[PDB]
Paper text:
Pseudomonas aeruginosa is an opportunistic pathogen that causes persistent infections in humans. Randomized transposon mutagenesis screens had indicated several genes from the diaminopimelate (DAP) biosynthetic pathway to lysine in P. aeruginosa as essential, suggesting the corresponding gene products as potential targets for new antibacterial drugs. Dihydrodipicolinate synthase (DapA) catalyzes the first committed step of the DAP pathway, the condensation of L-aspartate-semialdehyde and pyruvate to 4-hydroxy-2,3,4,5-tetrahydro-L,L-dipicolinic acid, which is non-enzymatically dehydrated to yield L-2,3-diydrodipicolinate. Tetrahydrodipicolinate N-succinyltransferase (DapD) catalyses the transfer of the succinyl moiety of succinyl-CoA to the α-amino group of tetrahydrodipicolinate, the first committed step in the succinylase branch of the DAP biosynthesis pathway present in most Gram-negative bacteria and mycobacteria.
D-2-aminopimelic acid is not accepted as a substrate by PaDapD, but acts as a very weak inhibitor (IC50>20 mM). Eventually, these complexes could be prepared by soaking of monoclinic crystals of PaDapD in crystallisation liquor, where succinate had been replaced with either L- or D-2-aminopimelate. D-2-aminopimelate is bound to PaDapD in an extended conformation, well defined in the electron density maps. In five of the six active sites in the crystal asymmetric unit the interactions of this ligand are identical. The ε-carboxyl group of D-2-AP forms hydrogen bonds to the guanidinium groups of the two arginine residues Arg181 and Arg193, and the appropriate orientation of the side chains of these residues is ensured by a salt bridge to the side chain of Asp168. The head α-carboxyl group is anchored to the protein by hydrogen bonds to the main chain amino group of Ala226 and the side chain of Asn209. The α-amino group of the ligand is within hydrogen bonding distance to one of the carboxylate oxygen atoms of Glu221. In the active site located at the interface between subunits A and B, the binding mode of the ligand is different. While the tail carboxyl group and the carbon chain of D-2-AP interact in a similar manner with the enzyme as in the other subunits, the binding modes of the α-carboxyl- and α-amino groups are altered. We therefore suggest that binding of D-2-AP in a conformation incompatible with catalysis is the underlying basis for the discrimination of the enzyme against this stereoisomer of 2-aminopimelate.
Numbering used by the authors:
A (entry chain C): 3 to 244, 251 to 329
B (entry chain B): 3 to 244, 251 to 294, 297 to 328
C (entry chain A): 3 to 246, 251 to 294, 297 to 329
Amino acid sequence: QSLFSLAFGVGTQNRQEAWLEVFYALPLLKPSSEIVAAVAPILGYAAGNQALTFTSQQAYQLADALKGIDAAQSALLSRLAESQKPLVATLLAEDAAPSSTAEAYLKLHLLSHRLVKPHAVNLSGIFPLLPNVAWTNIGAVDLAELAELQLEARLKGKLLEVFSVDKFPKMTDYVVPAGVRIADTARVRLGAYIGEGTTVMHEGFVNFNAGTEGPGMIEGRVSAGVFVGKGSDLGGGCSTMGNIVISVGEGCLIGANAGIGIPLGDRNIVEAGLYITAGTKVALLDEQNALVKVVKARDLAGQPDLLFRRNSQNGAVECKT
Amino acid sequence: QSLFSLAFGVGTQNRQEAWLEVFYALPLLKPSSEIVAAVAPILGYAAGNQALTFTSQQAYQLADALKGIDAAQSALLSRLAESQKPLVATLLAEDAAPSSTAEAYLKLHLLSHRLVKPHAVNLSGIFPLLPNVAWTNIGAVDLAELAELQLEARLKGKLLEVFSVDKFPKMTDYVVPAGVRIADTARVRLGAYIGEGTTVMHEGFVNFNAGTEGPGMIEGRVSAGVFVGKGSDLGGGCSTMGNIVISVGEGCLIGANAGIGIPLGDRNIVEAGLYITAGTKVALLDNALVKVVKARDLAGQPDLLFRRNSQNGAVECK
Amino acid sequence: QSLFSLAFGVGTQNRQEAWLEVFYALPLLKPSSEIVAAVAPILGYAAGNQALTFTSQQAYQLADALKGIDAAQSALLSRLAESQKPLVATLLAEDAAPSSTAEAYLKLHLLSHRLVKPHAVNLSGIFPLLPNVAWTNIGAVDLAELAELQLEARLKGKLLEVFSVDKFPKMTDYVVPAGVRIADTARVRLGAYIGEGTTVMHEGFVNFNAGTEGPGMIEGRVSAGVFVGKGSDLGGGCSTMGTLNIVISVGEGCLIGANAGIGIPLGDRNIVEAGLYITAGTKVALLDNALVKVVKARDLAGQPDLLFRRNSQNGAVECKT
Ligand SMILES: N[C@H](CCCCC(=O)O)C(=O)O
Ligand SMILES: N[C@H](CCCCC(=O)O)C(=O)O
Ligand SMILES: N[C@H](CCCCC(=O)O)C(=O)O
C-alpha cells in the first residue's frame, strides 16, 4: 500500500538498547513506490508500521539500491554508513497511533519540517513512548546514567551542561525550517509548526502539534493543538489554553498578557491584560458603543471583526463590532 | 559531636585562589560517627563548620579510610583523587548561617538533592558568600578573567558561551533529582526542591530555598521561600511573592498570569488573570454576600474559589 | 575628519564570503586623530563609513604602527594577526544609518559596552543589515549550511546545539559589562544597555537599543527603545510597549508590579499595581483619595509621584497623587 511515511534515522540508545531519540534528516510524507521497492526487501519489511533497526553494511546496500532513484536519500544513506550511532529505517503504512518511540520521533519531525500541519497526524498515546531524557551538550543521556557523566566532566575540569530534562527535545536541535526566527529556541518544542515569516520572540512558546500559518509575531504561549492563522500578532506573555480546541484566526492581535479561552475569528483584537474564557460574560456593543445585550464569550467564539476590551471605569468586559 | 552534614567536593577557583563554585556528588545529611571518625584525622578537622581543602594524595588516604565503612564515599574519593580541579571537604558540626562559599554550595546541594526541605536550613547571609560568576560551557569563570577568555575563543573560531551571569548556578548542572521534569533548566536555580512527579514547564520558575512536594505542573514562578503542596498546579506565567511566609496548599489550582501575595490553603482556587495581595478587598460568598474582607484574613482557609466578576470588576471568593 | 567610531573586529563569514557577525574586543567612540592617522594609510581608508577587510599581514603592520600611540589597540592587533577568522576594520566618520553588517554590529557593541546610551546612535534600517543566523555552540552558522552540519554532528555521536535563530545574538556572548547580573543571558540582546548595578532576573528581558541606567531589578520585559531610569524596578512578568506613535521610558525610582503593563512614559518615583495594565487611552480616576476628574492616561505621562491602581470593588482604574 501507499506508505504514509518513511525516514532513515540515526538515534541514541540507553545502556539496555532502548531508544532515547532519533534524528531524521530528510523525512518523507507519502514516499514513492520506486524508493520503497528498492529498500523494502532490504529492511525485512512486509507491511504495517515498523521501526526496523538496520546495519552499517545495509546502509551501503541501500545507498546503492537508491542510486538512480532519489539521490538525496541515497546520499543520506552513504553518510549514515559512517554513523557512530544506531540506525532505524521507520516505515509507516497508515496514519495510526504510534507503536514506537522511533515512530513517535518520526511523527514529530513531520510537523516541524512542515510536512504535515497540526492535527494532520495521529499523536494518540505518544507521551508513554517518549522517554524522559537528559538533554545535554553531548546529546541524549538516560536519567539513570546522568550523575555519573556529570561527575567525570567535573574531574576533567569540564562541564556536562544539562539544558532541559523533558520528554520533548527542542525543535531546532533537529530542524530549523525556512524564513523562521526563534530568539530562544528553548521555547519551541519539537512537533511545532513554525510557518514562513514567523518570528517567535524570547517570551513566545510553541508546543508540539501547535503553531503558526506564517507570517506572525509570537511573543506569547501557543498551547498543544493550537493554530494561529496568517498575519496575526501574539503579544508578550499572552496565553492560549490547551472541552474545545482553541484557535486564532487571520490578522488577529492579542495584547500583552491577555488570555484567550475561546476561538478567535478573523481580524479579532483582544486588549492587553484581558483574560477571556468560555464562561466570561461580555457587554456586547453595536457600531456605536451603546449596549445591545450581555452574552457568554463562547457564543462569540469564531466571529470575525470583534474588539474585546476592559472598561476601565467599571471593570466591565466589552466587545465592539 | 554528631555532624549536621558533610560532603567531598570538587570546585573551581579564580587566579586569586577564591572559590567560585563547588560540585558535591554525594552529600551526606547526618553522616555516621564511623565515617567522621575515619575522615577527621586525615583532614585536620576538630570541630565547628569548616571548608577544608585537601590534596590528591589525601583523597587516596581518605578513599582507603572509608573502605569497609562506606563504599560509595570511598569510590567517590577514588574518582576525586584523579581530579584536575581543586578539592574541598565540607564538615558542618551544626546547621548555622553559612561561613563560606563551599558551605553555601553544600547547603544549596542539600535542598536540591531533597535531603532537606525549604526553610529547614539556615541560609542567612548567603548572598555575600556566592560570588557573581560567569556560567559558561567550559565551566565557571571569574568576571575579571572573562573578557580575555572570550577573545581567545574567537581567535580559534570557537565560542565561549556565557549562558548566565549570576550568584546562583542552575540546578541541573549539579543535580537532577528523581522523577523530575524541567522544560528549560535556566529556570530552576541550585537550591530549589523539585519533588517527585513535578513537571516544570518552560514558563515555570523555581528559586533557591523554595519548591514542590510533588506532584505538580509548574508553569509559573515559585519565589524564594515558597513551598507548594502535593498535586497542586501553577498555570502558565502565574506568580507568587517572596513580611509574611507565602506558601501553597495541597491540590490547589492557580490560573495563568494570576498572582498570589498570600498563603493559599489546601484545595484553594485562583482565577486566570486574577492578581490578589494581602491588602486587596474581596467579596466573600456562601453566591450571596457575607462581608467585604481583606485577603490576608482568608489566608490559610481551605476549599476556596477566588475570582473576578466580569460585569462589575468585583473580586470575589466562594 | 574626527571619526564618530572605529573598531577592529574578527568575524564569521558564510561560504560566499558574506559576514554573519563581527566580534569587537575594544571598540572606540570618538577615536583620536593620532590613532586614525596611524591606520588610515595601511587600511586604504580615505573617508566615509567603511568596513574594510584586512589581512593577517596588515594586522602586524597596524600593530607596529600603533606601538607608541595606543598600546591596547596595538596589543589587540597582535592577537588578531594570528587569528583563524577574517578581520575587518570598521571606521565611521558619522553616526548614520548603517550601511553594512560590520557597522551594524559595531553600533550594537557601542551600546552594550555602555559607550553610548539608547537613542544616542543612528540604528535606522538595521534589520536588513543583520542577517538571520543560527547561533550554535560552534559560533554563527548560515541557515543554508546548518542542516548539513546538524547531520554530521549526529554521525560523530555529537550534537550541534542551536540555541537561537535570530538577527541579533545574545549580548553576553560578546560582552559582559562591569557590575552586572543577568540570570538568563538568552533574554538580553546585543545592543542592550545594562547599567551598573542592574540585575535582570530570569523573567526579565532587554531588547536592543534599550535598557537601564542602573541600579534596578528587572524581572520584566523592556522593549526596544525603552530606557529605565536609576533605582527603578520592573516586577515579575510586567510589560512595556515598544514602537516596532510614542517612545515609552521609565523614570528614576519607579515601581511596576508583577504582570502589570505600561503603555505611557512613566515619570519619576511612579508606581503601578501588580496585574494592572495601562495604555495611553485608558481613562483613570484621578484623586487628591477624593475624585478630581476622569482623564486619559496620556495627559499624565511624565508627571512625577503617581500611584496607579485598580479598585477591587468596582474595577475602577485610579491614580493617587
Ligand atoms: N498549557 C499546556 C501545558 C501542557 C503540558 C505539556 C506536557 O505535559 O509536556 C500546553 O501548553 O499544552
Ligand atoms: N523571589 C525572587 C526575587 C528575585 C531574586 C533576586 C536576586 O537573586 O537577587 C523572585 O521574584 O523570583
Ligand atoms: N515588543 C517589541 C518586539 C519588537 C520585534 C522584535 C524583532 O523583530 O526583533 C519590542 O520588544 O520592542
